Amino acid sequence: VLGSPAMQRIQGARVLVSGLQGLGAEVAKNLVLMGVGSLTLHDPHPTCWSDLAAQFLLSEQDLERSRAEASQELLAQLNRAVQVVVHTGDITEDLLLDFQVVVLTAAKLEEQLKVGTLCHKHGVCFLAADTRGLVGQLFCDFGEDFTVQDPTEAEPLTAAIQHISQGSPGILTLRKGANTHYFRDGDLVTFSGIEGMVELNDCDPRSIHVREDGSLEIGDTTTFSRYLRGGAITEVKRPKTVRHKSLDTALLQPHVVAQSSQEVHHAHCLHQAFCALHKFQHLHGRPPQPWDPVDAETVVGLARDLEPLKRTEEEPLEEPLDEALVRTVALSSAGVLSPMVAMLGAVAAQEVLKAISRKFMPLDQWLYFDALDCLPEDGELLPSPEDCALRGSRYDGQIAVFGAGFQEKLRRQHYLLVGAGAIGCELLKVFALVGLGAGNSGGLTVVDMDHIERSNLSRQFLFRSQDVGRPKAEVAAAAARGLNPDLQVIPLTYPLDPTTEHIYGDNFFSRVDGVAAALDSFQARRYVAARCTHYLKPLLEAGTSGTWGSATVFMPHVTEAYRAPASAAASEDAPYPVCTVRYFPSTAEHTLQWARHEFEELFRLSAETINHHQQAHTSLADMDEPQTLTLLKPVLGVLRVRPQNWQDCVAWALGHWKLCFHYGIKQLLRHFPPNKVLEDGTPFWSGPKQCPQPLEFDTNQDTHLLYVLAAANLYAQMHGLPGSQDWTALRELLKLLPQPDPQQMAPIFASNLELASASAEFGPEQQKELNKALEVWSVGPPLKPLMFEKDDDSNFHVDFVVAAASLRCQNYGIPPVNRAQSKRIVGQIIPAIATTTAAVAGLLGLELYKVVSGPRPRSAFRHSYLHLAENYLIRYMPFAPAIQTFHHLKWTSWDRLKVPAGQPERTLESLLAHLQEQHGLRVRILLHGSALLYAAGWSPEKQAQHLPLRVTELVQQLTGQAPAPGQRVLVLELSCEGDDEDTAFPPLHYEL
Amino acid sequence: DEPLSILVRNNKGRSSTYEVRLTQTVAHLKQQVSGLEGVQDDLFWLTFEGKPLEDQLPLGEYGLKPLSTVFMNLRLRGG
Amino acid sequence: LSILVRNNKGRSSTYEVRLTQTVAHLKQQVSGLEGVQDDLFWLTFEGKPLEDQLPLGEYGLKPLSTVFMNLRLRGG
Amino acid sequence: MASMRVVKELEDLQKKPPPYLRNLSSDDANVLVWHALLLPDQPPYHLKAFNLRISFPPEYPFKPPMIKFTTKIYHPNVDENGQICLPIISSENWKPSTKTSQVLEALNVLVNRPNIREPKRMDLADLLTQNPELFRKNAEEFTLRFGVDRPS
Ligand SMILES: *OP(=O)(O)OC[C@H]1O[C@@H](n2cnc3c(N)ncnc32)[C@H](O)[C@@H]1O
């Protein structure tokens, strides 16, 4: 997230990104987006045609010019805060001394060694990323001594403590939770909120001990005071130290971060191949020609020519260097691809951020990414050297790896990009640079319903600061056409939800050849996957969260269909329970949602009750109008007349403050004692875990004054009077009056002589007063209801709800809300990190290569999952499609039943007879979406009535809607006698 | 037939120890992890040595030597 | 012509609506037919919220408009 | 789709309806809604019936069904609008495994034995706690005024 201690060091850092080829451009773009304070480019070589196939900053007009100078303008334009300055001179020891992290992208081995030695001498962090075809390496040296402030990616653990005791161990008891299992002995803990133990707050952190049955201890607390209650105990992160060898010593004995021994040996073979490529480039002065057999043979001979001493002596390789892998790497090492550049740039930029901010765990000096699966299968014909020869086109950097025919096949495709946010924008960039649809016969399509918002704009790169309010699809399409002029993008504003199926009908999905879904919700992803499965379309789905990432491809009839987590899909839109709002808020998130919905019903419903409903047709004589007026009018002040007083003061704010917590708690305790239940008399436990007490406001405390400030500002904004922020003068003005409540204790509760109001003792006088207030408000200015806007900080919504939640949680003893719960809340969500978005976009680009390649076995496709903070990356082939069978019938998750209606539409009895005769199954229930057509348990007369009727006519009669024009098929779900309770028969496609 | 001592790594950098069986199905391990963490079974899928785990298969196929690490991966919603 | 009118409870019940007639006079009749309070949910086509002071021609009410309502408030 | 599960549950339940329920039928046009007559046993509600509407969201069972009374009822934890705050229907306690039979059993138990732990009508709960006889009389009046005749 946005950490103030970490981000202070980001803006103060300066990074050198040498070799600004495609990979260096991606690293520089990611660093600029993340917001590094300075960034020095260095690449004086002239731009070639091959560089355009993977670099997005360079255009065709920027040909025959220095890459760094040309890219400087766009890199500076991406973010104004970032200062990008090109460096013209050669690398000098003083220059490397000035910097903090240097990056050598696609640089020669000699220069890599020289710069790495110079940086390691001065303690400067060094990274040497590279990509030669479909295989890319990564090196990360952070000096001899490097201390990471926080190793893990996790909020420090906080758990509510029930009871603490004194003694030699000084054991303490905490409420049951997952944190109890999470807490471990030898850790470091701190505490800030506790009732009692006054000086224990702000003390030095101390260790703990884990005992059986969730028992812990702090030490010696006998000398301390009495303990009443405890808010929470916060875990403390333990700093770690990492030592990295220099590049010159590391080349001989590489340390690869992997997940299995096979992966380690594969990475060793890739390292040997890269060393062979560097040696070949040194000996001959020229990289291997595209797919040239003689150069590949020379490279593999050099790989065998490498000494056995070049490997570690403590673990011999199980086999000699496989000639096939080295030969394939040498053949395909001509050009540089766009997906590989995106992936390696993402990883390298994340490592640079780790170096700068001292966050997470740095890479263990060597990561090798293998993506050779995208090559044509061994049965198919490999590209010939004549095909891979450059022809002056901007795609030659990719033609040198895949060939001309594959480039034409990419040009012929016609895809669909559902959702263009961050993943959508970067996948669109990958599609544009790759060449997908850049032709007359090709095309593309972008589907997006939201508008550009500044908070989300702060991280994306296709969007600019002057595009706020424009649709995302239009701007993304314009940017994609800018990156590749030949590309034709059709931006569609209509979303893709079940209510728009008539726009995206059979013809629309008959036009497309594939779908790439980058959506923010699970329900939308499930719906898009269902549509793709129904229309048998390849799907490319990606999803990130923090530094996490996941890219998957679901080709029809070869991989399992996408199945979203139904639990998360349900949790997407679910209401919170009312019991926690009513009496017992168990957690701080409960009081958070309590404050949210309480302010919502206090303000959103207030406006309609002011003018519209009261003035239109109804009066106080409705179901319960006096309660609706009581919840809003008296709490904000007695009023009852047009307020000539300034709407920005403290007289009415503290009244609502007291009524919110103190008066409510007092009323609840009046209803029943906090320790006893009146009905129970002698319950199992008298007052179990529930003891709320009235809370008194403290002017010195920041939470109370912030709550008053937010309430006053919001009231002024909604009432229409110009509200001024109190933080400069009116905060002191409310501090100026310390005791406004003593003079106005009794009269503010209800009317003038209602200490408790008993039960409906208000009478006609209070009812008539409420009616008069309603009439005054109706003729007065109508209040404008305000929605939750995170971007607009003047409304004071998030701060107000957080302050209310904190106040009520401290009132109930619940630990205060942390930033982690606010992040987990759907509202106030953070933008996705640029690095992980680039990584998932590059993986999706590789999947697109494999899909466009044509008919592929299941073993070719790969579903990827990554965690950049832990440098944990996996790429596994997906499972075979699930085969579930019932009696003789056998079906997959993709196939469907086909039954033509014929020239005369079949009757329902005819359909049932046809099903029984053909597929050998007897249907007991047959629905059309929700409407029921035939049931086995129906009465014989009802069945005899329904059977002869026409199927389409019956559907029209039940639904009441005419069949959609140009609708080829009708989908029906059916069951069978004696079937499994959870079985899922394939849908019945009935033509009409 | 003897119980195994394996640890499942959480998604927040933490770990916990579990006692499983070679003949015990992966779905049972998923149930134990869900019960300890408090998350739904379908929301997460757990992997071992870079490859995913199938629910119906038993732990014997995957070669889970004692004191092994089985990472827990969540399904990612953000776009 | 025909415009797809749908309810949040799973029943569409398409009703005769035309651009020559004001949208409010048809929405009030639909609400009176359904029997649920109008302040509970706002009718909306293609994600565009509808306001008491909002011209319908500016956003271009499309034929077969994707009009559906989203439940709000808290009954208890 | 949840419609198949709802249809199967309704077909299974119609064969052996519980004693407190009767004529539980659904409309074929929209099978995600049920109409039932609730026949409690504890007074004064046992002298008549109560028509309730059970609506199943499309993502059932992962979203618990929404049960709402269609006829008025004087209960400590039932609003005049007809909503219910059954513990099983609560989000934190709901599970996909439980059927609707258990929900109906819990609803019948709740109606027979009024609950005061989570009063959706706090004033009525206070009246019941203070003077139960006045609450009893008010419940009798509400039933005789708004209730539907108990079928055979
Ligand atoms: O990059 P991101 O995480 O912000 O992506 C969110 C984008 O998703 C669009 N969206 C969301 N849901 C849909 C559907 N069902 N169809 C089409 N687009 C969709 C939003 O526009 C948002 O930008």
Residue numbers in the entry:
A (entry chain A): 21 to 1012
B (entry chain B): 79 to 157
C (entry chain D): 82 to 157
D (entry chain C): 2 to 153
Quote the passages of the study that discuss this structure, keeping the authors' original sentences.
ISG15 is a ubiquitin-like protein that is activated by an E1 enzyme (Uba7) and transferred to a cognate E2 enzyme (UBE2L6) to form a UBE2L6-ISG15 intermediate that functions with E3 ligases that catalyze conjugation of ISG15 to target proteins. E1 occupies the apex of the Ub/Ubl conjugation cascade where it performs two main functions: (1) specific activation of Ub/Ubl in a two-step process that results in the formation of a thioester bond between Ub/Ubl and an E1 catalytic cysteine (adenylation and thioester bond formation) and (2) recruitment of cognate E2 enzymes followed by transfer of Ub/Ubl to an E2 catalytic cysteine (thioester transfer). While Uba1 (E1) is specific to Ub activation, ISG15 is exclusively activated by Uba7 (E1) and specifically transferred to the E2 enzyme UBE2L6. Here, we present cryo-EM structures of human Uba7 in complex with UBE2L6, ISG15 adenylate, and ISG15 thioester intermediate in a conformational state that is poised for catalysis of Uba7-UBE2L6-ISG15 thioester transfer.
To gain insights into the molecular basis by which human Uba7 activates and transfers ISG15 to UBE2L6, we sought to determine the structure of a ‘doubly-loaded’ Uba7-UBE2L6-ISG15(t)/ISG15(a) mimetic complex. Previous studies in the Ub system have shown that although the single-loaded E1-E2-Ub(t) complex is capable of catalyzing thioester transfer, that double-loaded E1 is significantly more efficient at E2 recruitment and catalysis. To generate a mimetic of double-loaded Uba7-UBE2L6-ISG15(t)/ISG15(a) complex, free ISG15 and ATP/Mg2+ were mixed with purified singly-loaded Uba7-UBE2L6-ISG15(t) which allowed binding of ISG15 to the adenylation active site and adenylation of its C-terminal glycine, thus incorporating the ISG15 adenylate (ISG15(a)) into the complex. The double-loaded Uba7-UBE2L6-ISG15(t)/ISG15(a) complex was prepared and imaged by single-particle cryo-electron microscopy (cryo-EM). Two reconstructions of the Uba7-UBE2L6-ISG15(t)/ISG15(a) complex were subsequently isolated, which we refer to as Form 1 and Form 2, with overall nominal resolutions of 3.38 and 3.21 Å, respectively (masked at 0.143 FSC). Both reconstructions exhibit the same overall architecture and do not appear to be functionally different, with the main difference between them being the strength of ordering of the SCCH domain, ISG15(a) NTD, and ISG15(t) CTD. Globally, the Uba7-UBE2L6-ISG15(t)/ISG15(a) complex exhibits a conserved architecture in both forms of the complex with the AAD, IAD, and FCCH of Uba7 engaging ISG15(a) and UBE2L6 sandwiched between the UFD and SCCH of Uba7. Cryo-EM density linking Gly157 of the CTD of ISG15(t) to UBE2L6 L121K and linking UBE2L6 Cys86 and Uba7 Cys599 are clearly visible and only slight structural rearrangements would place the relevant atoms in position for catalysis, validating our strategy for trapping the complex.
